[PDB]
Amino acid sequence: KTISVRVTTMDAELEFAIQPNTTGKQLFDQVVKTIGLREVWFFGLQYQDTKGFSTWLKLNKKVTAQDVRKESPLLFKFRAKFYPEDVSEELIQDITQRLFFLQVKEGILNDDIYCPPETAVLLASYAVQSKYGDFVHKSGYLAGDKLLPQRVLEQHKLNKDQWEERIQVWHEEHRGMLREDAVLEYLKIAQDLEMYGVNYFSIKNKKGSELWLGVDALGLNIYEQNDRLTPKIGFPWSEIRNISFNDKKFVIKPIDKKAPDFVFYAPRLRINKRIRALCMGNHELYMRRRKPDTIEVQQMKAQAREEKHQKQMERAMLENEKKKREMAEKEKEKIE
Template sequence: MYKALFHIPQVLNKYKCTSSENKFLLLLGYVIEAADIKLVILGWYCRLCVLMMPLKFRLRKTRNYNVLSRNVFVLSVVLIDKTTLECTLSSDSSGLDCLHNVCQRLGLQQPEFFGLRYMSKRPYPKLRWVELERPLKRQLDKYAQSPALTLAVMYYIHDVGLLQDDVTRSQYFLQVKYDVLEGRVRASFDQAVLLASYSLQAEFGDHQRERHTPEYLKDFKVFPAQVIKETEVSTLLEAVVWQYSSLKGLGQALAETYYILEAQRLSGYGQETFMARDEKGSEVYLGASLLGLGVNSASGDSQTFYK
């Protein structure tokens, strides 16, 4: 035992043990080993702890789920109004379970018109729909860039009377509004002004001359980018203020309905576009909608429509 203790100062210098904790562990290891040959393994373990302390371990990155337990995880869902909520699900939950969770919390009683999308790892298409009947986590692990979903209208309608629930109608209106603003539904100057007036009536109620001036409304996004490029913003604002003031007395729910009805008349309403190639190998765009299937050349020079 005493012979082993003579080696302690040399070992402390060899392993550069400066902290009191490290010195204590190393000393304890030698004392245990010297006291009883049967405790050699324990002594070596103490010394190993000292040697491992300076090392830094890097763990492999995993999916960015907020994991509550082995079978429960939390993911984010971006709503149509761009706000976010979190859903707590089990690893066996289907996409439909998640959709019903979101709709229940929104008070949305007609989930059959909606779906969930995610950003795909693949270059095209970047946005993919969740297969509602399949386990959600498996789909996201295999195909998604990140464990995040977006709520969106999946099935567009031509009969606005099918939207019997106020929350469903409002969410549907928001989706159609963003379709217009982001250019998926194409509008002329007059159509854009009319839609903008319905949007303002739905958001603010009746026009107030002192408040809803062109200067005030210029900070609200109510016009498609393409229309803004083609027309002076001041001209658009003056036109929409006049149109908006003419809607006095129109209820906000009815303004949403009129917006949807007007958008249904426009090109691109309810259309989902996919890239493809024709028989010559040229790139074309397929537009699937309620009216049928449209085939557009990549240059936009030709269009064929199939009902």
């Protein structure tokens, strides 16, 4: 009757049972409802199709109707398909910031997002303040954690302990900072990386030259094969009139009627379709951002501002009572 389904978020292993007629939308809604997520626009469910490829689940189509790998349970990954332009301004809920922080942290540690050594150490200390809190405390406490990318550890011949000492220094500066604030500070720094939130695809021009295509929140970018940090030519969403898609081929059409069209090719149709989905999705988010916030969004932001300010003042009063009780304790004891 039912199909057992596993849905792994960055920090949850959710088990569900779908009906044979369950749509991807029904499954998605249950996932976000269970984790208590409102900002769904950035997210989607990934799966390995029977051919071995990473695929986004189509929500307006039965889960059973797609090329879901024939295993028990069905394995899906809940992850962020789209990135914001600014984490501070667009990642309102703590659940959203934590799920983006863990996915970005994963990408940094796997060498997928280039991060320089000094920045990697700074990032690691924020991950530490979030896990370990304030910090007697502990010695060799960071030995069992994955804290830096492998190219950082490779390039720098620092023994394991020297890295933890270098991060421990940064971790002691952080003392006082909330776990929630460490998560936002990680995202603030991580979002300035060149590879952050960029979807790379291997393309060829009309000549047949091998290039890279980046699809990000602010537009499109063309990279040389030997360099994915610096785009050779960039296309902001504000300058793209449209992108024409036709079987492995895509044409970036400019808003400047004097500017030329740009023709590129995907090696397979799977890749071209993937490009179109991320182009359409990112430009729609971009469109939303140019138009002022929904009253729903303005209120959600105000709600979060009220909650954070209440927590800040609640903590400021506990600290003030510590000084008052201590002050009275000394005022009484002086007597004799």
